[PDB]
Amino acid sequence: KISTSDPVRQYLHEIGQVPLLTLEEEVELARKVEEGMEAIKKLSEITGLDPDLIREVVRAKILGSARVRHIPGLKETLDPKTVEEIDQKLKSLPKEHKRYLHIAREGEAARQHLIEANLRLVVSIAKKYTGRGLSFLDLIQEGNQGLIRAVEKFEYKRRFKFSTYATWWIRQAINRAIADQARTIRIPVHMVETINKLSRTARQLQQELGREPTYEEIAEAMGPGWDAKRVEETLKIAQEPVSLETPIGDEKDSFYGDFIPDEHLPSPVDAATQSLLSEELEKALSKLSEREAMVLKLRKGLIDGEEVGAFFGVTRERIRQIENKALRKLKYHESRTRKLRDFLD
């Protein structure tokens, strides 16, 4: 029905059913998580296999079958033959090392469980970074990627709980998304925190003057290197795009795009121009000595192009010689039979 309520119902149902007991429940999952890490690393040690493969082979058996490996990540890991062969090596590990996969499997089990239980925390957080230019669901989910980031670095040894820790790792993820995505034209996190301060500073300024501040006053208030040219520009880049398709004039049936002209495409006038221009620019090119005419024609007309480096073997005295003598003979006869005189464009 309405996509907010059933998700809320979805995880709020789960936090309600699985609120994590303050100290205990988080303590267990957390320590289990860390033993998974160590386990995985000592596994890489005894197997010569990378931790990325241990995290993923143990994730496959605990989180999903062939299904999850084949569709999400295309295909470099045969889910069956590859993952089960990995599981093989793990079994071979005697009573000693085997203990580490057995631990690793739960290590992650515990992991996902904690992420589920705190989805509430995200939504409650995410709830306030609402009208920033991001969808409630979008906000909630990047905040979610934030809580996961948190689960990776949480050291239970340091007594503080995951609540205060997820708060920060989440607010960071959210704020980064808001800056990095909210707009059409991308703008780095600096122009973002920059422009927000301008508007912030603005509001404060209006509190006094009853005069929407001249850019002079925004420069000041902002600080060290702020000048008119800066505020004006920022206020321009901050100006988001206009929708190419807006109801125009009377709202009836008027799209905005019909009004915008075309600028690469040569209107018929231009097609006619470059027709004669090349037709007769080509006539002059053939009637001239190819030596320095083609040199300057191709070193200025074909690809981009330097006097000395312009002529093949002959130096600059014959370049300047023919360039300036052919170019003028060409121009003074073009003066007689005025074809080019009418400045083509």
């Binding site: 057995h102 230019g133 398709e245 807006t246 915008i260």
Partner: protein
């Protein structure tokens, strides 16, 4: 119509949210057998894969009448203050107690079956062939209390979303449903025969001439040309771009966030939450408004234009809406 699924609501049921339709097979019951094509709720579904789980409190200071491994008694008061549901074993951290439906197979010699393996009655679990598992389900090799508990959920293909429908759509041998309907058509009464004509129509064309039906599910979204969704310099520093580009971003961002969510690790509430968003977005570029209406940001509570409606506006009923060169 083609896939015989309640045409309207059975789809929006699995499609946009999580009501999972049992695709190939699912041995464990609800009360009855495997619902080849029927759909169930996440609440009952949850009841189907972990087994059963019900944890309960302790007043500050009371002791439980049951021990660590003493199987909870069907319909027993685990500790003063609570009344636990039927099949289980009793567990307890220093506040609450926890019930479990799978039977405990205490092992003292090391457990070699690994957590997660699919198990059927007999599959070795621990202490060599001594500890054999007698029930169907996943494996949970707990080692605090040295034990091997076997959950009861056999592999049940519970799937939701276009994933589920893509499957169902590939598995159909239209020529079977054609013959099957041809006879449901002419023989029974008009009620079920009539609705069968209607369902035979689509299947006939698919097969007749043209292309096959697996393609109705999208996994590769074509993107309209760029010069057709310009980015242009207007006046002063203002840029104007085709609404479509704001939808495309949506899709792209969600699609990406998805991938990163799969690789990072995957709490499944979070993967579906986005798989939904993703679906909605996939709609948006195609056709906006048949379900929920997208708006870039305050200024225009105006539905972002969309492919579908660009084409329509072309020749649709209005005075000549946008008809004329």
């Amino acid at each position: 119509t083609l896939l015989d699924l309640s045409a309207t609501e059975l789809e929006q049921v699995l499609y946009f949210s999580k009501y999972i339709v049992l695709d190939p097979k699912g041995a464990i019951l609800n009360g009855v057998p495997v619902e080849k094509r029927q759909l169930l709720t996440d609440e009952e579904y949850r009841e189907l894969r972990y087994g059963k789980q019900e944890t309960y409190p302790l007043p500050p200071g009371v002791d439980a009448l049951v021990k660590d491994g003493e199987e909870v008694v069907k319909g027993q008061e685990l500790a003063p203050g609570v009344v636990s549901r039927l099949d289980g074993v009793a567990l307890y951290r220093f506040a609450s107690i926890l019930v479990v439906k799978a039977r405990v197979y205490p092992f003292e010699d090391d457990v070699e079956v690994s957590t997660g393996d699919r198990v059927a009655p007999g599959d070795v679990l621990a202490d060599g062939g001594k500890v054999k598992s007698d029930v169907y389900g996943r494996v949970e090799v707990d080692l605090v209390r040295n034990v091997v508990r076997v959950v009861e959920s056999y592999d049940i293909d519970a799937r939701m979303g276009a994933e589920a429908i893509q499957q169902l759509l590939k598995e159909l041998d239209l020529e079977a449903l054609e013959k099957e309907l041809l006879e449901e058509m002419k023989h029974p009464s008009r009620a079920r025969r009539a609705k069968a004509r209607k369902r035979l129509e689509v299947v006939r064309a698919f097969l007749d001439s043209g292309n096959r039906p697996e393609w109705m599910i999208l996994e590769a979204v074509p993107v309209l040309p760029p010069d057709l969704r310009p980015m242009v310099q207007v006046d002063g520093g203002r840029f104007a771009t085709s609404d479509l580009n704001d939808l495309y971003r949506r899709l792209i961002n969600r699609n990406n966030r998805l991938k990163k969510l799969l690789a990072q690790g995957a709490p499944e509430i979070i993967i579906r939450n986005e798989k939904r968003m993703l679906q909605e977005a996939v709609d948006a570029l195609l056709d906006n408004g048949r379900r929920g209406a997208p708006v870039t940001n305050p200024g225009s509570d105006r539905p972002l234009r969309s492919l579908t409606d660009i084409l329509s506006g072309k020749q649709g009923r209005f005075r000549q809406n946008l008809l004329g060169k």
